Amino acid sequence: RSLPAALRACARLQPHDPAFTFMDYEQDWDGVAITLTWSQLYRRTLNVAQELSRCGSTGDRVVISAPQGLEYVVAFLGALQAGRIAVPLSVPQGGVTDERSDSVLSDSSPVAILTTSSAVDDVVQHVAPPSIIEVDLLDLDAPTFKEDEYPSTAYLQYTPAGVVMSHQNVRVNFEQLMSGYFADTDGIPPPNSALVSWLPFYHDMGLVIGICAPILGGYPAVLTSPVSFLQRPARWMHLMASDFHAFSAAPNFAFELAARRTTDDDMAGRDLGNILTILSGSERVQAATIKRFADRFARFNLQERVIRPSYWLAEATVYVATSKPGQPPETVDFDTESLSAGHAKPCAGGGATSLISYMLPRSPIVRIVDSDTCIECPDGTVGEIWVHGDNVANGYWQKPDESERTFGGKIVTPSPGTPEGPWLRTGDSGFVTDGKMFIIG
Fold first, then answer.
1. What would the 3-class secondary structure string for 314-361 be?
2. 218 burial type by CB count under 10 A (0-12 exposed, 13-18 middle, 19+ buried)
3. Quick one: DSSP state of residue 211?
4. In the chain, what are the domains?
5. Which long-range contacts (CB under 8 A, 24 or more apart) does 28-33 make?
6. Which of 404, 400, 409 is nearest to 366 (CA)?
7. Are 137 and 117 contacting, i.e. CB atoms less than 8 angstroms apart?
8. What gap in Å lies between CA 21 and CA 257, rounded to an integer?
9. Given 41, 73, 186, 193, which is the most exposed site by the fewest CB atoms within 10 A?
């Protein structure tokens, strides 16, 4: 049920159905849609894996350092198909004098690096060796794999520590994410709908949301790059106002950006009424942002209920909880002074801190824990948010200590129904009350 097996099944079940579409705005301002059906995507994946099989052995790492695009996608899936541990990274940044890539390479000791012609120069400047493969230069479309002793680890996620993400972790994150998009359908996307996403593949749920999820869900995805989004934020609205029912996800700032930079003219002839769900990240969330976004696009048929607040851990790659499914999110005002003192009390007014209401998840599990004692906090008492579940990684690559410290939390005298561990210490402060959780920050 790993990605390679998921893709193989899609190749067989629906060979000629569109699978991945990358909107390239680098040449054409209106954007050129580069599409690959499931069988074509699968074929390109087999060919990459075939190339990788000549370097090193099963379990070796293969870094991916390419720009946002279909080369990155097949490169990633190619690594998995070959029984290698992918290391999704971005094209090296910071110049020749910057050692953030050198550090990640030195920590993972990859056997090869998958990149593209456009990035090969920068990538080589940071490889002081692993084989350098220019994906776009291969016969990706040229018309049998071990997949027996393949590693349990799918890839390493860096930000120098690499979170070890297993196939299980990826699969379960996928399951919960989909539950977030479609809480009322067991996480299954209705007919003629597709994921829209411009989130970077190298970090922050970008990989899981844009590549993994669609492959495992067997649904098409319309992708683009963060640079193209910044350049013309209206493009995100266009993609969700295309000839399919869209569902997307994005950081809180993206809604402010899209609302302010998209003109009424940019929306001429666009209807946003068929949108299914747009998850909004919980990092740096501004209360009014979502409503403003909804208010400015209301005239173009945007339904306010589609915007769903979601809580995920970008660094540990963990989908945690979501608002109530059915309509705009619920925000509660708490007394600031009290809350600053560690206690939650509903005083709704002016100087109060308004927090978004997230339903406590079934999976993973959330517990508010006193970071100093490792003992759960009664409802209403602020503490650190601890999470436990099959989508929570076991630790970092070759760092037992750190893994223990971060992913190995154990709760003291756990209350009934609460496992002793292991728990991921999120580093987030928050609380629970009436079956709901809130994040202060």
1. CCCCEEEEECCCCCCCCEEEECHHHHHCCECCCCCCCCCEEEECEECC
2. middle
3. I
4. 1-441 (3.40.50.12780)
5. 29/232, 31/224, 31/228, 31/235
6. 409
7. yes
8. 24
9. 186
